Enzyme design. Sequence first.
Site, mmCIF file in Angstrom:
data_model
loop_
_atom_site.group_PDB
_atom_site.id
_atom_site.type_symbol
_atom_site.label_atom_id
_atom_site.label_comp_id
_atom_site.label_asym_id
_atom_site.label_seq_id
_atom_site.Cartn_x
_atom_site.Cartn_y
_atom_site.Cartn_z
ATOM 1 C CB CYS A 114 -0.962 0.011 1.192
ATOM 2 S SG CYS A 114 -2.030 1.450 1.203
ATOM 3 C CD1 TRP A 286 -7.090 9.395 -1.649
ATOM 4 C CD2 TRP A 286 -8.148 9.392 0.335
ATOM 5 N NE1 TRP A 286 -6.204 9.839 -0.700
ATOM 6 C CE2 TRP A 286 -6.830 9.854 0.524
ATOM 7 C CE3 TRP A 286 -8.999 9.308 1.442
ATOM 8 C CZ2 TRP A 286 -6.342 10.224 1.779
ATOM 9 C CZ3 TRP A 286 -8.511 9.671 2.686
ATOM 10 C CH2 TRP A 286 -7.197 10.126 2.844
ATOM 11 C CD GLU A 291 -5.576 2.754 -6.717
ATOM 12 O OE1 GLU A 291 -5.859 1.685 -6.142
ATOM 13 O OE2 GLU A 291 -5.770 3.879 -6.197
HETATM 14 C C1 HEM Z 1 -6.400 6.293 1.928
HETATM 15 C C2 HEM Z 1 -5.945 6.238 0.666
HETATM 16 C C3 HEM Z 1 -5.347 4.955 0.056
HETATM 17 C C4 HEM Z 1 -4.603 4.977 -1.040
HETATM 18 C C5 HEM Z 1 -4.237 6.244 -1.833
HETATM 19 C C6 HEM Z 1 -4.204 3.633 -1.338
HETATM 20 C C7 HEM Z 1 -3.418 3.258 -2.401
HETATM 21 C C8 HEM Z 1 -3.207 1.949 -2.709
HETATM 22 C C9 HEM Z 1 -2.789 1.454 -4.000
HETATM 23 C C10 HEM Z 1 -2.517 2.331 -5.248
HETATM 24 C C11 HEM Z 1 -2.685 0.126 -3.894
HETATM 25 C C12 HEM Z 1 -2.309 -0.826 -5.031
HETATM 26 C C13 HEM Z 1 -3.686 -1.324 -5.475
HETATM 27 C C14 HEM Z 1 -3.669 -1.994 -6.825
HETATM 28 O O1 HEM Z 1 -2.879 -1.580 -7.725
HETATM 29 O O2 HEM Z 1 -4.488 -2.938 -6.993
HETATM 30 C C15 HEM Z 1 -3.047 -0.270 -2.540
HETATM 31 C C16 HEM Z 1 -3.063 -1.555 -2.041
HETATM 32 C C17 HEM Z 1 -3.456 -1.931 -0.779
HETATM 33 N N1 HEM Z 1 -3.930 -1.088 0.214
HETATM 34 FE FE1 HEM Z 1 -3.999 0.969 0.093
HETATM 35 N N2 HEM Z 1 -4.735 2.785 -0.381
HETATM 36 C C18 HEM Z 1 -5.447 3.574 0.503
HETATM 37 C C19 HEM Z 1 -6.153 3.095 1.587
HETATM 38 C C20 HEM Z 1 -6.018 1.867 2.183
HETATM 39 C C21 HEM Z 1 -6.660 1.464 3.423
HETATM 40 C C22 HEM Z 1 -7.598 2.419 4.173
HETATM 41 C C23 HEM Z 1 -6.266 0.199 3.691
HETATM 42 C C24 HEM Z 1 -6.605 -0.731 4.868
HETATM 43 C C25 HEM Z 1 -7.164 -0.274 5.997
HETATM 44 C C26 HEM Z 1 -5.360 -0.206 2.629
HETATM 45 C C27 HEM Z 1 -4.708 -1.415 2.511
HETATM 46 C C28 HEM Z 1 -4.199 -1.873 1.321
HETATM 47 C C29 HEM Z 1 -3.871 -3.243 1.006
HETATM 48 C C30 HEM Z 1 -4.011 -4.449 1.951
HETATM 49 C C31 HEM Z 1 -3.424 -3.281 -0.245
HETATM 50 C C32 HEM Z 1 -2.963 -4.551 -1.004
HETATM 51 C C33 HEM Z 1 -4.172 -5.003 -1.819
HETATM 52 C C34 HEM Z 1 -3.916 -6.216 -2.682
HETATM 53 O O3 HEM Z 1 -2.918 -6.949 -2.422
HETATM 54 O O4 HEM Z 1 -4.733 -6.434 -3.631
HETATM 55 N N3 HEM Z 1 -5.235 0.834 1.742
HETATM 56 N N4 HEM Z 1 -3.361 0.877 -1.850
HETATM 57 C C1 KNS Z 2 -7.422 -7.359 -13.762
HETATM 58 C C2 KNS Z 2 -6.929 -6.183 -14.577
HETATM 59 O O1 KNS Z 2 -6.381 -5.119 -13.784
HETATM 60 C C3 KNS Z 2 -6.675 -5.148 -12.384
HETATM 61 C C4 KNS Z 2 -7.209 -3.800 -11.937
HETATM 62 C C5 KNS Z 2 -6.504 -3.390 -10.664
HETATM 63 C C6 KNS Z 2 -6.067 -1.935 -10.811
HETATM 64 C C7 KNS Z 2 -5.766 -1.236 -9.487
HETATM 65 C C8 KNS Z 2 -7.050 -1.024 -8.718
HETATM 66 C C9 KNS Z 2 -8.207 -0.671 -9.401
HETATM 67 C C10 KNS Z 2 -9.389 -0.485 -8.701
HETATM 68 F F1 KNS Z 2 -10.506 -0.140 -9.365
HETATM 69 C C11 KNS Z 2 -9.412 -0.657 -7.327
HETATM 70 F F2 KNS Z 2 -10.555 -0.473 -6.649
HETATM 71 C C12 KNS Z 2 -8.267 -1.007 -6.633
HETATM 72 C C13 KNS Z 2 -8.364 -1.188 -5.130
HETATM 73 C C14 KNS Z 2 -7.051 -1.010 -4.369
HETATM 74 C C15 KNS Z 2 -7.254 0.137 -3.397
HETATM 75 C C16 KNS Z 2 -7.710 -0.067 -2.102
HETATM 76 C C17 KNS Z 2 -7.894 1.029 -1.261
HETATM 77 C C18 KNS Z 2 -8.374 0.795 0.134
HETATM 78 C C19 KNS Z 2 -7.627 2.314 -1.716
HETATM 79 C C20 KNS Z 2 -7.160 2.463 -3.025
HETATM 80 N N1 KNS Z 2 -6.877 3.677 -3.551
HETATM 81 N N2 KNS Z 2 -7.011 1.389 -3.808
HETATM 82 C C21 KNS Z 2 -7.080 -1.197 -7.333
HETATM 83 N N3 KNS Z 2 -5.361 -4.302 -10.514
HETATM 84 C C22 KNS Z 2 -5.459 -4.953 -9.205
HETATM 85 C C23 KNS Z 2 -5.401 -5.333 -11.570
#
Ligand code: HEM
Ligand code: KNS
Lengths: 416, 414
Positions: A114, A286, A291
């Site tokens: 994250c 947010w 993303e």
């Molecule tokens: C508040 C603003 C937040 C921002 C800007 C943010 C940003 C991100 C981004 C860009 C990712 C990569 C997601 C992806 O590419 O799929 C991520 C992953 C993650 N975030 Fe944050 N996040 C936020 C809030 C949170 C909160 C509130 C939590 C937990 C309480 C959290 C826990 C995680 C976890 C566990 C992942 C890994 C998800 C996975 O492995 O699919 N995030 N976050």
């Molecule tokens: C399968 C093809 O691509 C897929 C799309 C996805 C692109 C990244 C992405 C797109 C989303 F719409 C989304 F909701 C999240 C959630 C992650 C997240 C969580 C929190 C708490 C805050 C925050 N800011 N983000 C991530 N990536 C995993 C591979």
Amino acid sequence: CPRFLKVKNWETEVVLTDTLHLKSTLETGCTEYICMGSIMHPRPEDVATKDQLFPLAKEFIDQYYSSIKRFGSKAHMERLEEVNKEIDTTSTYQLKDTELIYGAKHAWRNASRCVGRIQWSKLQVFDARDCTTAHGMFNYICNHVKYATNKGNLRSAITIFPQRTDGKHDFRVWNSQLIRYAGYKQPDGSTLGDPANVQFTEICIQQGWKPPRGRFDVLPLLLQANGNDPELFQIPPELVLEVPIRHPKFEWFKDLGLKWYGLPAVSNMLLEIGGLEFSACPFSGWYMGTEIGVRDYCDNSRYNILEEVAKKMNLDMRKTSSLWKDQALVEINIAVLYSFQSDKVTIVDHHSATESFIKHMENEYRCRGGCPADWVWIVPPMSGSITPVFHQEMLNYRLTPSFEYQPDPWNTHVWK
Amino acid sequence: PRFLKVKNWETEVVLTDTLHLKSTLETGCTEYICMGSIMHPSEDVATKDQLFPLAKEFIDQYYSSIKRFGSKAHMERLEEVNKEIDTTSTYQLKDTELIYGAKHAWRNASRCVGRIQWSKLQVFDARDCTTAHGMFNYICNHVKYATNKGNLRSAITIFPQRTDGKHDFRVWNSQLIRYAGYKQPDGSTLGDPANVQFTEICIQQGWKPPRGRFDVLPLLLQANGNDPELFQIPPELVLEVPIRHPKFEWFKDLGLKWYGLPAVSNMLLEIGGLEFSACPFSGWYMGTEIGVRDYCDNSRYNILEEVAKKMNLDMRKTSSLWKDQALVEINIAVLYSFQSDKVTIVDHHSATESFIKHMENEYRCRGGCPADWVWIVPPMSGSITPVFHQEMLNYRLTPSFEYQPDPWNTHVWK
Ligand code: HEM
Ligand SMILES: CCO[C@@H]1C[C@H](CCc2cc(F)c(F)c(CCc3cc(C)cc(N)n3)c2)N(C)C1
Ligand code: HEM
Ligand SMILES: CCO[C@@H]1C[C@H](CCc2cc(F)c(F)c(CCc3cc(C)cc(N)n3)c2)N(C)C1
Ligand SMILES: C[C@H](O)[C@H](O)[C@H]1CNc2nc(N)[nH]c(=O)c2N1
Ligand SMILES: C[C@H](O)[C@H](O)[C@H]1CNc2nc(N)[nH]c(=O)c2N1
Ligand SMILES: [Zn+2]
């Protein structure tokens, strides 16, 4: 193993020293002879046993009373004593409200993938351990969405449903996110809506959902409580904040008819606190612009609009070396950021976000002795090397409390 | 100890990796801590005792590669290397083993996206070299062959192996052709900031700097452990491309240019326990190496502000993505310029596409392909290239290219 580990930022020469890694608990998947850092995921009916649980609870309770500068106190030793008795007589135990809040905040603080963790301490925790039915799950989730959306001034939140017991009574949100768009596979192989959600949409349709079959149909919540078959519920549409995507310079960009929801809320992960497993714990923050702008819109197996955007920019699309893909990706990501900002919906560009993370990571090294980070995820999917994280060496390790993956519920659920 | 799968999440192609079972050098990771993002994860003179297994292992894979494992030649080549390590504390590679070794060090280079070309490698044997003038001569032949008037060709020149550590051959430049960097009195930097220290080492050694912005550095060559000597590459051997943009005609007014030949000269080639501390190798550029890293890093030419200036972009807020817009334009100009001058260059879309094809190949015929996602994914536009969604296993196979200390930290002058 060594007691001090150094990471270097190759842009600024700053060297940081990690001691926190000594407290890592789970396996990475790497060994001395192979690295699995680019692997995405390195029976769920099985639950922890008494002897497995005693040290996991003790480790967390120790950590909790250390955080509040009460380690070794009378309160601390009475808490250990109390928790050991519940585990002995019930094979489980209940977290105090303060422990549940600390553990959740720390699961986010420990989330190595994250980039947003600078905000970890500012997380509204909703205790839903008194929930018994899927209607109550729906109620709790609607309050979460409303509170977290906050009319555009988004606030991070988590709602925590009852922990796993015997593994046959799990609460699950079958949705991967609380708010996603439906995907409809066509008879001709094409896809309407969001390709990533085709499978889940077919499940909703089977369970009784009547789909509008449009490009942006908010999916219904599929909620499972206490191990019962899941139930459908339509989120009230006035609770789903959406943003139409337009461009500052290109008048035609609104003519693509693109929009996106404002609240990213992951709902399919497992929250582990002191060996207790909370299989339903939707959390929301947010968006970082990329993303939506890069992945949701430009991934081939997603909305896949680079082509259409490039055509409206009249770019030479015959050769790759013109870089038409890269040119259109930037405009798309400008329109996403411009739209959320115009509508006053919280959003962060990848520059500001990575910049905050470097500052956060340095503060955690200073005050906590380390900050686990997964470079493969921390670095944004576009413009990587012009953000500071790209040049930052990172150590990746698994601290508990933590968010984990878990199998999809349709693959394991025993149907009533 | 199992077959490991790697998945591409775009195509859903799954490959099965058995090759990692044959690795024996360490990655730096542990079950508890992953160091996949550490650049140099964590005296060197091995003795006869350490040397024979390493050698025996390398001869084994050599004769295995030519479908003659356990033959008479294999039996005898083992005893010949045995006798030689025995008596002289080292041994000499045959010409065939040397070529095979250099090609497979490239093939094993986890960080290199350009490995689909690995076996089209021209290997110049310079193990008879004894002086810096000889080094300079072999390097000029390398540069002239590999440049080839713009149609570049992959080449490596291999100088004598390390013996006791006191007689090392070293090329003090990190690349054969680089621009110089100058610390200014007012504080700024002229030319290439990454080479500021090395440029001062050259000036301190007698070099007369033009103090322009793109000054080709002289070669600093160390032979047999002696003090390094300075040499000027004949300018007619140094091919350069002036960078102009196909749409913005003011881009030439920036006065930018780059050299055509990327030639890494500071690494260590390890083959069967032998250390070649001087082994300059060269291919051709991926556009992003120049247009993203060389021109747009903060610690390099740092030209983004100037470009977005002339593009008349809103630079007050980060969220206008003015840096990102200027980066694509700079990288169009690099690719446009090289292609127009018919100098070989590959763009990051075609190269990652080729690397995926390379990966399929290696899994088919070899059982794996070590790959460092952190380095393989391009430094811009990552997830719109196929390698971003490609899972990769990283592991350390030998023969290999390794890092070594900078010579000015180790060398004792006289
Ligand atoms: C508040 C603003 C937040 C921002 C800007 C943010 C940003 C991100 C981004 C860009 C990712 C990569 C997601 C992806 O590419 O799929 C991520 C992953 C993650 N975030 Fe944050 N996040 C936020 C809030 C949170 C909160 C509130 C939590 C937990 C309480 C959290 C826990 C995680 C976890 C566990 C992942 C890994 C998800 C996975 O492995 O699919 N995030 N976050
Ligand atoms: C399968 C093809 O691509 C897929 C799309 C996805 C692109 C990244 C992405 C797109 C989303 F719409 C989304 F909701 C999240 C959630 C992650 C997240 C969580 C929190 C708490 C805050 C925050 N800011 N983000 C991530 N990536 C995993 C591979
Ligand atoms: C022929 C065209 C080639 C292309 C397009 C190419 C591309 C690349 C790129 C983009 C990198 C990352 C470089 C960086 O960011 O510093 C790299 C790394 C590397 N390449 Fe290749 N390369 C080519 C040829 C070669 C050859 C001929 C060799 C060896 C004989 C080689 C060995 C390596 C090694 C060892 C690295 C790792 C560098 C390090 O760790 O600093 N490459 N290559
Ligand atoms: C300190 C942070 O900034 C620095 C900038 C630098 C930018 C990347 C780079 C720029 C170059 F000009 C260059 F020659 C090479 C050589 C690599 C190479 C070798 C071969 C054989 C072929 C080929 N095509 N490329 C790499 N990167 C390492 C980090
Ligand atoms: C910290 C990190 O390891 C370092 O900045 C790496 C990241 N990935 C890279 N990838 C390539 N191709 N070249 C590099 O120099 C780097 N630098
Ligand atoms: C193959 C690779 O592990 C995979 O595509 C990863 C790369 N890095 C990522 N980084 C983020 N933030 N989100 C992702 O989904 C991924 N996917
Ligand atoms: Zn690792």
